[PDB]
Design a protein around this ligand. Structure first.
Ligand code: UD1
Ligand code: UD1
Ligand code: UD1
Ligand code: GN1
Ligand code: GN1
Ligand code: GN1
Ligand code: CO
Ligand code: CO
Ligand code: CO
Ligand code: CO
Ligand code: MG
Ligand code: MG
Ligand code: MG
Lengths: 462, 462, 462
């Protein structure tokens, strides 16, 4: 039996942001979302999130996530950010007076923390019958972390915060993860004895360690060797570092499953994205949101896709696209913009300098050059000429061949197998197999240039 | 006298690919190509490649490479992938029964291995009269490598594979490169004594080390300090790591020879690419295949060129281009697509949102905006107006000035010094110094807006 | 009282460049500019730059910088590059014979050196009454640096250059920064005793250390723990390394002040660039020159801006732009090119495949697709149709709606609230609230396709 509390009520001042800290994102989820996902998977009996000043703007998001994960998640309010020890006091208040399970505590700013790490913590805590078990790790750069103080016998004595530590204690590289398990009665007892006489004038959860040690209670540290899993984020430098570590891991998972990723460092892949076997992803690419790529695709370089579905054997090269689907074998890019509601059929082509918005494009249809397609439905095996505009519904049939520089003034229907001539402005329906035209005939004005541009390079050349 | 065997007949299952492992690429060559290049340079008397199941799809590539490098390269077949010791047995069978030279063995998945490392190995082997000499290195992360076992006296005892090693042996950081020299008679003798009773149930080449030691034969390890040269690739994570290490080295070679590379980490340069002095390469750039850049060019950011020749003092900025030539002083980009067969003369310009395919563009000619040029030949000092389409042969002369929004309906010829008006559809030849036109005259419809868009922001503004 | 000499007269041969070494750039300033900025801030009584062969091409730049920093900076000439000891002799000659202040020496190729490091040096020098104080640091890779030689008692004995050091001395990791303070009389004395009998046959400033030690003078090393501040650049590999270190620092400063930078490694930010709170910068972005970004902007991915001003709450996505302004709330990109003199009003939009040059675009005006706008002034709340060309002054009023595929043949004026039809060539003024047109009427040719493309997929479909 376990209750997990998530401390998410600090001001977040070191982020320097008007967006609450725990709402900042990496890999397509907010830090609080990452932490709640890992905990839902652990499936404890209770899950409490302590919220503070910005609670109006965070609580609804927590309720959406409770729905999403199919479990209830309570919110305890912490009126003023008096310290992590005080946040835990506020959290405990959402539990019955007589609750008797373990209490696990973690921060909203430790977003790589995973279900396994949490499980192992609870198992260690129970195995050594500890009044408190604290996760620790060891870091080349421990700046900002509580330092682990040990006796000569390697027994944990205390946690000292970066603001309170001596120059000498600051060299300690073993750090507090800020992830704990507690005996409830011992935790309640230690919290009632915290005082705020320290360099931040705050009630430190970390003092509970020396307090329980005081009482001769069992204090156990558990060393997490993979430091990333328990790394924290207090500012945007640390946010981008952990986002980059998490992104290397996501990419590695894909590479081990069969995806070529030419340059992991410049390939950003959100956590829910799936990618098929033998796809090759070229440098400078972001795959975001619920993007799904099939097998044997080529993607990038310099492509950004957010919520885009791509079939098998497609090419999507230098493409900026969102909320769109791209069929098997289709070719998109280079220099192609897909706006929401774009559906391109199998073996379709959208070429260079083409933008599509809210349009359906049938199997085998090509829009290869300098064209805008908006609010239109186009059939199968059609060909849209270069430098054209769908001026915006318009329906174009199958096996149509439209000429370069055609404007389609919505709404108009072009029948199956119809053609338009180059330079046509289409303002009315075109029957199946008809040719629509409107450009006037060419006229040559002889020797114009000698007359109107006399002594010019063009005049001398003629 | 030396025979080199290349073991390339394993299944490659950890790549998770339908393309044989040794055919995966980095820096524009397959791993097997890299390994055969380094060995051809060493120029041994014999060169044998052991191939397995996918031999149908690899052997032809080996024959093309034998042709390319001007030497014969035999292929020995290994029916079933029974282990590296068994692959070497299959390899030896392509040698005469009575062969008496040294036998060098290396893997197809060690692609940074170079001629010098191989030479030094053979020199060390001969100098210490070893029955076997094995290349080793030392690594922070030795996962997956055979560990070097040494006695108290630093004498090499054995090689233990990652699957077979104790937790304690796994901490050993000195690893087997999988590159060896052998006395032939000792190698034949040791191979006939391998058994497959180990964690992979395979015949391990690595066991030969403890077997020859058994017989009191001389076993010598040679430490390669530059670990990269002997790094292996068993999966796509390791492939991208070694591709990135190799790319840093290629870029560094260019920087030391006089190329500014603003961001090595995001500049990918294939091994055959040459680049002239005082060129500056901006971030996000890939130079691929047989690309050649002259001196004092500016290239990037975000440019990909495959098989592109660029003269001296050209600019090629945000350009995606292949199999094309760009003359001295020419300017291309930003946002420019070159398809195969593009030839742009000296001081030519191809601007933003211009795509060219299979066209010749003469000295000093500019195509600056939103235009497609396909299957066309254009002369010197001409100017193609914005938003135009070559609708596809068409020949345009020198000193021509064509107006914006001209469609050139192939095939048509435009004489030297000719003009077209804006909005012209050109369907017939235009004489030298003539002006071709087809747009109708402008008509203004007064107060249309008050009538047809009454109470609109446009109506109120008028 | 202090004189600072900057040695900038070496040939720079290891750069392999026709641009003098000290003129190569990182983060938008030349190395010599970086070094002179840091020294001006220290504000010593005298500032002397020693220049050599390329002095004609460097001295004017030094005079511009003296003006910029509001102080005089003398130039001493060093006829032939006889060595750093000889450069300092040439430098001293720009001082009075009887000068009595401290002499600080530094290189033009140490460009992260900052005012604080210099101040601390002078303070240490004066505090220990040293005849010479040398800055040192310690490096994993000390290749190319003079090695610090110490006695058993940790007293500094000598500096040995990489070319002159034994294999064993080469393992020394503590290096000479090439930054010194001197007693003037001791420096003059030691310089007159240098000889050039060493591996480079040069007069080494570094020998002065062992010479003053010889005379029983006080020699003090001061260890700089942040090695970057004193790192040198002798070749383009080292230039890009230090440019990348400096760029991480600039980005970090922005992240700590409130800027989200998703990928520091692929975000390049020049030193004078300012960026507002809660802006998000996406990967592959360069912000160059005097670029200024306001708050809550979104910038990138793949955007390059040089000297661009962007208001608050704007979006500038996949944009290549220079010397332009973008108003509050405006939207630019993806795939947008801004050339110098572009001014886009608040809430304006420049869309995909749009290039603007030397044009003013008023509040709320949209140019969303495939258009070139050159040398034009456009009013407020207007809408420019897709695939249009300003053929280049032209003035367009407010609340205008122009139709797709309009060519505006400069110079023309379009009144407030005017419209043009799709496919119009505008060659004369259009009154306020008028509609201008020129395209001919559509004609459908029935069954053309069965007649002219018989048995085609289009013919069968009809
Ligand atoms: C005193 C303390 O605990 N310090 C720990 C805290 O430092 P650190 O300084 O990171 O602690 P923070 O200021 O980030 O606050 C901890 C978390 O608890 C929440 N919160 C904070 C204050 C408050 O009054 N109410 C509240 O709910 C915040 O949402 C925050 O996410 O985590 C580090 C690891 O990341 C540990 O090494 C430190 O030992
Ligand atoms: C038992 C053995 O040798 N292990 C070595 C092998 O491990 P490793 O596990 O990498 O060996 P692999 O499975 O990659 O096979 C070695 C190479 O030989 C070829 N091959 C393999 C099996 C086979 O039955 N037939 C065949 O021809 C494959 O093409 C492969 O490229 O290389 C490592 C370095 O990269 C060394 O540290 C290991 O000591
Ligand atoms: C002999 C000497 O001093 N070596 C130092 C020099 O090596 P390093 O080999 O880098 O010295 P350089 O060749 O770069 O020359 C030093 C600087 O002085 C100027 N210059 C050089 C030669 C000359 O004849 N005239 C002249 O004015 C150059 O502009 C150059 O920027 O800096 C290193 C750190 O960067 C130190 O570790 C070395 O101890
Ligand atoms: C071809 C065309 O007329 N496109 C229009 C059209 O673009 P959308 O792609 O629907 O957002 O509506 C816009 C007004 O929202 C206007 O700015 C633009 O000119
Ligand atoms: C200006 C023009 O008509 N371009 C054509 C033309 O492009 P290419 O660039 O030749 O591949 O042929 C294509 C059919 O292969 C067609 O899809 C496209 O519309
Ligand atoms: C729409 C138009 O006619 N643009 C012209 C025009 O471009 P600028 O953007 O002004 O540089 O002048 C150029 C001659 O300098 C010519 O190459 C091009 O065709
Ligand atoms: Co924190
Ligand atoms: Co291997
Ligand atoms: Co130097
Ligand atoms: Co037109
Ligand atoms: Mg704080
Ligand atoms: Mg295996
Ligand atoms: Mg030198």
């Amino acid at each position: 039996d376990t209750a997990v509390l998530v401390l998410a009520a600090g001001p977040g001042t070191r982020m320097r942001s008007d967006t609450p800290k725990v709402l900042h994102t990496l890999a397509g989820r907010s830090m609080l979302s990452h932490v709640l996902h890992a905990i839902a998977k652990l499936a404890p009996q209770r899950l409490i999130v302590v919220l503070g000043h910005d609670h109006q703007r965070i609580a609804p998001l927590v309720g959406e996530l409770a729905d999403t994960l199919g479990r209830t998640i309570d919110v305890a309010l912490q009126d003023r950010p008096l310290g992590t020890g005080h946040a835990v006091l506020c959290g405990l208040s959402a539990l019955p007076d007589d609750y008797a399970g373990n209490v696990v505590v973690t921060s909203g700013d430790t977003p790589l923390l995973d279900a396994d790490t949490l499980a192992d913590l609870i198992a260690t805590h129970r195995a050594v019958s500890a009044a408190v078990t604290v996760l620790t790790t060891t870091l080349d750069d421990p700046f900002g972390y509580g330092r682990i103080l040990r006796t000569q016998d390697h027994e944990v004595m205390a946690i000292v915060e970066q603001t309170d530590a001596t120059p000498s204690q600051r060299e300690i590289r073993e750090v507090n993860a800020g992830v704990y398990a507690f005996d409830i009665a011992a935790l309640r007892s230690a919290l009632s004895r915290l005082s705020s006489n320290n360099a931040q004038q705050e009630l430190y959860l970390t003092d509970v360690i020396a307090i329980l040690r005081s009482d001769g209670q069992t204090v156990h540290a558990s060393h997490v060797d993979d430091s990333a899993l328990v790394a924290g984020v207090n500012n945007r430098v640390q946010l981008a570092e952990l986002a980059s570590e998490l992104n290397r891991r996501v990419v590695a998972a894909h590479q081990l499953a069969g995806v070529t990723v030419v340059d992991p460092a410049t390939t950003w892949i959100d956590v829910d994205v799936t990618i098929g076997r033998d796809t090759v992803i070229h440098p400078g690419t972001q795959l975001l949101g619920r993007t799904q790529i099939g097998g044997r695709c080529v993607v990038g370089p310099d492509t950004t896709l957010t919520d885009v579905a791509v079939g098998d054997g497609a090419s999507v090269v230098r493409t900026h696209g969102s909320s769109s689907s791209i069929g098997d074998g289709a070719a998109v890019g280079p220099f192609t913009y897909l706006r929401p509601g774009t559906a391109l059929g199998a073996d379709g082509k959208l070429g260079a300098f083409v933008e599509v918005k809210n349009s359906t494009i049938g199997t085998g249809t090509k829009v290869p050059h300098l064209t805008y397609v908006g609010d239109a439905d186009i059939g199968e095996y059609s060909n849209i000429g270069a430098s054209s505009v769908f001026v915006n519904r318009t329906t174009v049939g199958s096996h149509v061949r439209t000429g370069s520089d055609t404007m389609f003034v919505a709404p108009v229907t072009i029948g199956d197998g119809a053609y338009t001539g180059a330079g046509t402005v289409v303002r009315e329906d075109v029957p199946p197999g008809a040719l629509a035209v409107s450009a006037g005939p060419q006229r040559n004005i002889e020797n114009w240039v000698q007359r109107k541009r006399p002594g010019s390079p063009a005049a001398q050349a003629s």
